[PDB]
A paper describes a structure:
Based on a literature survey and a preliminary activity screen of heterologously expressed potential para‐carboxylases, 3,4‐dihydroxybenzoic acid decarboxylases from Enterobacter cloacae (EcAroY) and Klebsiella pneumoniae (KpAroY, 89 % identical) were selected for further studies.2d, 13 Both enzymes belong to the UbiD family and are related to a ferulic acid decarboxylase (Fdc1), which has been shown to facilitate the (de)carboxylation of cinnamic acids in the presence of a recently discovered prenylated flavin (prFMN) cofactor. The AroY monomer consists of an N‐terminal prFMN‐binding domain (residues 1–339), an oligomerization domain (residues 340–475), and a C‐terminal α‐helix (residues 476–495). A comparison with the previously reported structures of the fungal Fdc1 and E. coli UbiD14 shows that AroY structures adopt an “open” conformation, where the position of the prFMN domain is more akin to that observed for UbiD, compared to the more closed conformation observed for Fdc1. Crystal structures and in vitro reconstitution data unambiguously demonstrate that prFMN is employed as a cofactor, and that oxidative maturation is required for activity.
A comparison of the KpAroY and EcAroY crystal structures revealed only small differences, in accordance with the similar activities observed in solution experiments. A putative domain motion might allow the UbiD/AroY enzymes to adopt a more Fdc1‐like conformation, but this has not been directly observed.
Numbering used by the authors:
A (entry chain E), B (entry chain D): 4 to 494
The structure:
């Protein structure tokens, strides 16, 4: 029963090519990410790249006591193994946990390995920059980043209002991090409330976690009093409550079994240029595959303490590549599943938040026309997808004999089951996502500002009345294995 | 030095997962194809399928002295190993051979392994159907097929005119095969000239060949006296003339080192229904991945002899999947290369006749914009492609940082470097190909007859003025090997 990051590493070590360690010295600045680019970053990272093992770097230059984990979630198959289901059903299996969550519980400090070591920022010798190897993903980044920081925080006026969300933070100084907070999201609203009263907002950043927690926390959750409800998904996935502990230096909870916890406060009335120390003009690589722009005005966590386990692992990601595809893509798929299946039961066979869109921009919907009235519902399923997940950009529709996880087979449906002046429907001027660099006025006369897009539905389903002409060549069913057993061993 | 199929097999056996044998009894009717569907048919074949080893079945039900080879050209990497070049350069490499062909030569029967065993149709016990296995691809095919028949044929009046072509053939009786010949092709014009005079056309069907010969025979060649010029490509690929032997029962040449040669004559004033023995309504699977209809009026080869090597291999294909992509796709790529490079030298970086289009329907063009004036040449390249290969359907244009052999990366360009109402150009009413089942009046109000199409250009290149915003996140160059030697040691 997996309850923390090390229980997960143990499971991976029982399967081939899921976990890999190296003792060869690596520089956290640029080099480590450059290495994993080849081994397992995947997704929208520039070629060459591939799906591979999660990888542990034991020998980090300048950090003789540290080790860095990347790629834990950077494969769909791997995520399936870590949660005990089939990779094609991963979105549905987690969607079931979302529906029957198990609440987290509070434990005492004696039960929290994340507090086996406490480094108070009090200490004159404290220096976040030398305590933690925060990797730099590319040389043009704004600085070192932590990329899997699970932030816990509460409303400053109503303490029963909580939030759990993944963030990335740039290291800005001996005890400072900058942190981008999405407008409108709960923790930013918390921070705006505290700042309007001139007060800091206490927060914990929890890194190195059971992958069920990271995966579960990307889904929308209900809000109950003191609920930290995102944690309920992982509670359901393991059938064991996620354990919280009180912070040592701030009045906010932290993840009891996390590897590293950064406790601090968002400062009132303070802001920094994200790239103030490099003037690179960039932040770090974004899920579409491009380096984003540096944010000119960011809030700052003032660090009051770092607590960690003995031999703490620092967990982050590279790419963000396939690791982002998994964390973002399963929620994208679940919400599309839920919307289509409630409106058109039995129609959708599956949906894939394609890695080529980082799990957000590109939806592949596999439908089955069962009867004459299903003609015209394939467009309806596309409208449902675009309405339910507004950061989507394009939809590709295929039938149930097309493998939506096989990009060759998607392009095959786009070649023999599509006519350009019939099957392609453009929907201009719909808000999409600012990190798509083609969503700009300069790219298109129908785009009125950044993050607005034309959204395109590629209908590659066979028209109902023509289906008799579109049967794929029927090869006979045979068990191939007796013909070459040793060859099918390689699985 | 590779000079026959067996030398090619021995080369394959020096590389991992390129060649596989099985002694498990197999039914050449349907079951064999059913097995290789899972092991390595690839291409447009229904999932599951994949690229895998070429496969030899040694244990053939009803044919205890036979063994059957499939999948020899069913892998771009395998074709590259076989011709001694890099997969990404394959078409450039065969294109060089097309330009400087090495003419074939005639050798005596003593230098002709293909006549080690002679089976005259003279013999009352001769029966084409029990002598050779002719696999069926699906249970609904017209009948047993030979799918890699290299035909040699000459003009019945002017013997200096020759032709060398690949055909498929259905086994129609004791000593008859049906053979479709493409209208206007040289061998068909030889046939019509002979039929118009009331005379048979002598011919040899050569099977089990140096892959160089099959690959080279799919390119257009010039005509010179007694040239058999398609063999000049294989000659240049091997820097050794292909060897011809005089047939034993008909006045026409055969491939000296072929595994199997069927000698016969196309009969005048005789036609058969392709599926006359099954009434299946179908021929066999076509390269777009659907079953073809049965041709109701095919000419007949009356067999006069079958010669073969000792321990002869019957070589054919399954799917036809990836084996067709290689055979058809390299000529498609070479012709696009030649046209674009002549018109816009330096602009095309590479082209991929994508396997999802069977090597014919879908072109991925990789261009590099070097200067402002290249803005607008990407579409020019697309037109060049559409002009020179009229069976193309759609073009996808990408820049030099997109891996065109990686369908995930194509879709990525389709997602972040494309706006539907800007980047997509439809060209309606252009003759395409009849075996694309969506090219019918029933699919589209703009299609006036079967085999006419809308042809779509998807411009997924970065507009020149915007290039600085579209740089893929620049992970540092690092040699990953030292960090994980034994992992990279699985190459």
């Amino acid at each position: 029963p997996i309850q923390d990051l090390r229980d997960a590493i143990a499971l991976l070590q029982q399967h081939d090519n899921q976990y890999l360690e190296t003792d060869h010295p690596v520089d956290p600045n640029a080099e480590l990410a450059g290495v994993y680019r080849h081994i397992g970053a995947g997704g929208t990272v520039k070629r060459p790249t591939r799906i591979g093992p999660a990888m542990m770097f034991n020998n980090i230059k300048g950090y003789p006591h540290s080790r860095i984990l990347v790629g834990m979630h950077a494969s769909r198959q791997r995520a399936a193994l870590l949660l005990g289901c089939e990779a094609s059903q991963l979105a549905l299996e987690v969607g079931k946990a979302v529906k029957k969550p198990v609440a987290p519980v509070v434990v005492p400090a004696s039960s929290a390995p994340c507090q086996e070591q406490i480094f108070l920022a009090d200490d004159p010798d404290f220096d976040l920059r030398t305590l933690l190897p925060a990797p730099t993903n590319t040389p043009i980044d704004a600085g070192p980043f932590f990329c899997l920081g699970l932030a816990l925080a509460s409303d400053p006026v109503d303490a029963s209002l909580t939030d759990v969300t993944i963030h990335r933070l740039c290291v800005q100084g001996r005890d400072e991090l900058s942190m981008f907070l999405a407008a409108g999201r709960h923790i930013e609203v918390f921070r705006q409330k505290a700042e309007a009263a001139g007060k800091p907002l206490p927060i914990t950043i929890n890194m190195g976690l059971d992958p069920a927690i990271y995966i579960g926390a990307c889904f929308e959750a209900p809000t109950t009093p003191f609920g930290y409800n995102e944690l309920g998904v992982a509670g359901a996935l393991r059938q064991r409550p996620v354990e919280l502990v009180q912070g040592v230096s701030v009045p906010e909870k932290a993840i009891a079994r996390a590897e590293i916890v950064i406790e601090g406060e968002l400062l009132p009335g303070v802001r920094v240029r994200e790239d103030q120390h490099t003037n690179s003009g960039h932040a770090m690589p974004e899920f579409p595959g491009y380096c984003g722009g540096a944010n000119p005005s960011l809030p700052v966590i003032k660090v009051k303490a770092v607590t960690m386990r003995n031999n703490a692992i620092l967990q982050t990601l590279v790419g963000p590549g396939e690791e982002h595809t998994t964390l973002a893509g399963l929620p994208t798929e679940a919400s599309i599943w839920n919307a289509v299946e409630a409106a058109i039961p039995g129609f959708l066979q599956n949906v894939y938040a394609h890695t080529a869109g980082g799990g957000k921009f590109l939806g592949i919907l596999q439908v089955k026309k069962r009867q004459p009235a299903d003609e015209g519902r394939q467009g309806q399923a596309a409208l449902l997808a675009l309405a339910t997940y507004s950061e989507l950009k394009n939809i590709i529709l295929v039938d149930e004999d097309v493998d939506i996880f096989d990009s060759d087979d998607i392009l095959w449906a786009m070649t023999t089951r599509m006519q350009g002046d019939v099957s392609i429907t453009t929907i201009p001027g719909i808000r999409g996502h600012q990190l798509d660099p083609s969503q700009t006025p300069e790219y298109s006369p129908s785009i009125r500002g950044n993050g607005i897009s034309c959204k395109t539905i590629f209908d590659c389903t066979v028209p109902w009345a023509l289906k008799s002409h579109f049967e794929r060549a029927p090869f006979a069913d045979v068990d191939p294995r007796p013909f070459a057993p040793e060859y099918f061993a390689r699985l």
